[model samples]
Target: SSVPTVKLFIGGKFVESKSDKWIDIHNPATNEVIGRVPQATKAEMDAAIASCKRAFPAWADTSVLSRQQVLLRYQQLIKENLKEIAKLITLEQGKTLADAEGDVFRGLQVVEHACSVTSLMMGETMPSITKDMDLYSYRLPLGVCAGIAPFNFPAMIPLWMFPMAMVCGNTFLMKPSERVPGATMLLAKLLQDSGAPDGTLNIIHGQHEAVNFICDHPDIKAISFVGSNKAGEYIFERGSRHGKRVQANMGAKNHGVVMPDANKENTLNQLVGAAFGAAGQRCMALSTAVLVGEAKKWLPELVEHAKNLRVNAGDQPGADLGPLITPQAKERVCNLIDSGTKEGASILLDGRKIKVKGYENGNFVGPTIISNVKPNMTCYKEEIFGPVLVVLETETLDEAIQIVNNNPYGNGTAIFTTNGATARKYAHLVDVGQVGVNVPIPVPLPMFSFTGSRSSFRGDTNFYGKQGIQFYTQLKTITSQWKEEDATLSSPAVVMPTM
Candidate 1:
């Protein structure tokens, strides 16, 4: 069977790109070329941006309630096809089907939240600022916004950008990571089918040149990005230099603090899933585990669970995790593990060369555990975005807080404890943006934004929820004083008037 080629989505239609350059989309579990995505030509990008610019005014003019209706239909369509979308995510991205579904579901919650646009976009009004005057402030859409998504959560991240931007009356252009464009393509189709006008949402596929183009494009008023620290910093710098509103959600070294008094069985279960799940590609993935005091004893059990995890194809029924996205990704993870050992960390269970029977050629890296991982080690410093859990031990809660606070990236971190005081102390003093008391992945539901701080985020407002609305829109304030035809008129005043 022939592998499909991903098409550029513009003006509500998917068209084969005219560009000669293309990148192969892989299924990491089977080492198959599932699809091809174009390195969209500059002409194609301009066309997409032009399409969005053309669509903006009418979309912006559409009543907010009318936009909500479109989101309502889109939401239903997503609910109906959630399973199919998850399958596509697994096939292309190599995460377990359940995790892929979760990827879609979390983004859908944002879409669900977007349905409350009428209320969410409501304005503030001061009935009487002065005797016969009034003041009002409204949120208005910025034109031609764009989102550059990462390969890990193609569906969710793109969903985070366009839906919030669109429902708020902004048209969007999405540049899905060149490697994983399938799920986002399907999402574009659903939004089109949901009665959104042509060119309301557009998608283009490419690499760095494409990203650079989006940043430099004048028509693009706002940009949202999710990816590595290197790329996020670059995007934020370039986009903001161009005077565009850019929110770059970058890489993370998320840590899970296991307190001695926490439920051992439950904490271990959640730690294994959070650290190794999605092969640790998630920005919120617990890449480091800080064991406080007696909690260090659970290290052996953590290794045991990590060892028992079944790593296989994403579609395999009982598989706990799947392969990394590419052979290059696998190589990077192995190199980090090697560096960790060279720098004096102890490897408990190494699976750098694990070979599954039928999928031997796949990009599979088994769950790895590294102990005595100090902050200075190579694996500890870099965002080792794979199913490798690094361990560190500290004597007290204060020490753990210092360790977490001193880290560069501050995306998300969690604490496992039953005591409210311990949780509170950690949650309050911890410098990371999002915190989880018992939950491993502390990503908020759509009502709250995914607010990563320090180096993990670039912009002031993070993705989705109320902040998302603010990111995609501009604030307009109107101060009005209207007089009846028979009312007395005031002379022009050069001096400022007080209320």
Candidate 2:
């Protein structure tokens, strides 16, 4: 297959930007300008919104079964093209091929979940609310919705938002990360081929200007965003200010608690994989490992394990780590590592100097492990979205839990331990949104809603699972009565009556 000259998928057609301006899309692994994607102007954004509005009625009026069939076909198409799509993701985004494929597979799961939208969108009924009065509520589509996706998991995150919204009958506008716009365009093509109507799902490529246009556009009824906390908050605040429904999933300082009774070998292996995988670019990556009691004894071995793991370009087979997304990201990771060192954390493995054999100009950073990271240190307090791992010591499990709870980010946390009682207690008591016992990187499956409380997520509804269905639609209640029925006189009903 030939590499596509990246273009915008607007109104169900692949076209160039109205303006001649374009941005070069680089291959992060090679640091070469692989292709160019159009920078959509305000006019193009408005045109896309108008197209969405035009397509909304037909899509919304389609029967639930018809939507289900479209979604099922989409799922099959994604599965069949998984390998090719994965390669595109890795080439553009610089994650390992395996990790890139995994990203696509996760999106495939959400698409599969969308296939059941017909049943999932069904509402409940309340019979005999007042004798002859029967009350029932059903969901309706919100017409037009938009998703602003980040570059970390270019294909997967957008898949999480748009498919659910589309299956629920909303026309979608997707603003994919400009850094790697090809993945989204490819996915849009796949969606279009799978019976999605033209103008029902459109993909636009650009930066903040495009994002702001989509968020505040009067035609867009709802907006979903996944990115840094700063950007997420902006989307939520501005979109909601314009009366648009918004669900913004933001950044995290995800942690993993290692208990003294934890399986040392297995826990170490999982931590290594979770911390350094995807070069630690994930929002739920285990960047911090809180060691409780004597669990600190395993830190040396874990650090050594992270150090010895292979770090190479994304195209290199068996490479466990890849380059950061951009040169700026590389600098940020380096600065955070320096901060850790200045704050008195022991540097176990310094990744700042790592350079791959073939991709010397690539934005590469190795797996860095820092031990004795104090809770008061800036490195511990802030989210380091890189391949840098921190080990913080706690005297007891309670202290570990307290530290995890006090962090502003409540996205994800995990506990590795052999004691079933302790695991159960942590599961019930942990303040984090997603918890894993004897597991690492506790991202939920497509069947379960992924949500974060406190500063990590801002919205009433989450993405994927059943929560996604509710996010893209609204509810309406109906009551019916026969014209021939006689009117009943009201009785004294101050007190509620039992069945």
Candidate 3:
């Protein structure tokens, strides 16, 4: 049972890519070249699409109860192998074992949510709008759908797409991130063990070229994507032009607004967790903090506390943060921090030269803090997807809200205050997709649809929850009536009557 040297999972079998080329996979913790994933070619992509088309009819014909059974078994298998899978995630993706386990659990929750697809996929009826006329609507699963998942949550995001699509009777083709391809291959094995139909679920590993082919493929009826905003827009535009249903969730520069009435100590602790957790790799990570009211008194102390925060590998018990996924990512984060310093912002705690005791070669950066940042700076406007936090001073709640709303990326936002009125106003007025009154990382649960506003999302729907069902299916209205005996049509009578 040695883990099969990672390869593509297509037509329910593990096969090497036809391209004969591979991408190097690295473990960010120790800068180790852990493994390699084959780069899928046009031939393999065509074969996967064909396999899905062939499997759709039978999968759609399965009873709701049968689909439920498959999901239940899948859930059990995931739970049974949770530790093994989580370790694979950490080893490949560079998150801690605990964080990796959390990722798997979030994905498992989506599986739990998929178990209810028997009910969620139900249609509606309008009875009769006219005499003896009946109208009804039923959701029909798209023949073949595909998902292009990013590397941040390698396990969780793919689960968001595949389980729901499969349970709803659509065959799926997944293009998992080349950075962490092992987890997806393992997931395919688990699905097969749970009785997933052959060719009903498939995976391909590659970079942008493979992703472009999947998006442009005419046979793929729908596409769901989660990644950087630039890439998301590209997928949405190209996929939609090809007539595929698209839901592309892009980047975020999330903001956390701290009101004067908020519990300062408690809020700081929560901010630490939200800002640095996952090495600030999450799209929903709170990269910006807005301090309302008197900032001179409280802002300095908050910066100091952020500086002393713990940073280490995921395996350690009390470690607060872990390394970035790659040395390239580490360099990007460090460069941005340097830009902040050069732009006249006060560098509170410099993490650029940080060195962990045991893992010196690790792709590690300390939790960094910068103050006196204005709303117009590049550091403020762009998404710094790293373990760096920027503080902006605001005199009133209105100013704080304005600063947050003015940002281009509106994926997630939060407010920490005691006043219910202020919290409610922020929730209603903010343009972001997900909002938290006093919470950080306001990602909705598996049962609720996750979406963002502004340039954050393209297309009309979101992934998972009710919106996911709609995105994966199309609507068709049926109108019918029964005619009685002796029914006749008077074609010659053309007179019109006025009421």
Error of 2 at 334 (Å): 0.6
Error of 2 at 432 (Å): 0.8
Report clash pairs, candidate 3: 96-314
Q: Best candidate per lDDT, number?
A: 1
Q: TM-score of predicted model 3?
A: 0.95
Candidate 2 local lDDT, 1-499, one digit each (tens): 4334677777888887776777777777777888877778877788888888899999999898988998888889999999988888888899999998899999998888888886899999987776556789999999888999998998989899899999898999988888878778878898899899898998887777888888777888899898899999998999989999899999998889999998898999999999999999999899999999999899889987887788888778888878888888999889988988998889988979987888889999999999988889988887788898999899998888888888888888899999999998888878988999887988899988997778789999998898988889899988864322334545543544333
Each model's C-alpha lDDT?
0.91, 0.87, 0.85
Q: Positional deviation of 291 in candidate 2, in angstroms?
A: 0.8
Candidate 1 clash pair list: none
Candidate 1 C-alpha lDDT tens digits along 189-256? 99999999999999988889989999998888999999998999999999989999899999999999
The CA lDDT at 264 in model 1 is: 95
- Residue 321's C-alpha lDDT in candidate 2? 78
Tens-digit lDDT string for candidate 3 (312-337): 87776777778888888888887777
Model 1 residue 252 CA deviation (Å) reads 0.3
Best by TM-score: 1
Show model 2 residue runs off by greater than 4 Å. Answer: 1-5, 483-499
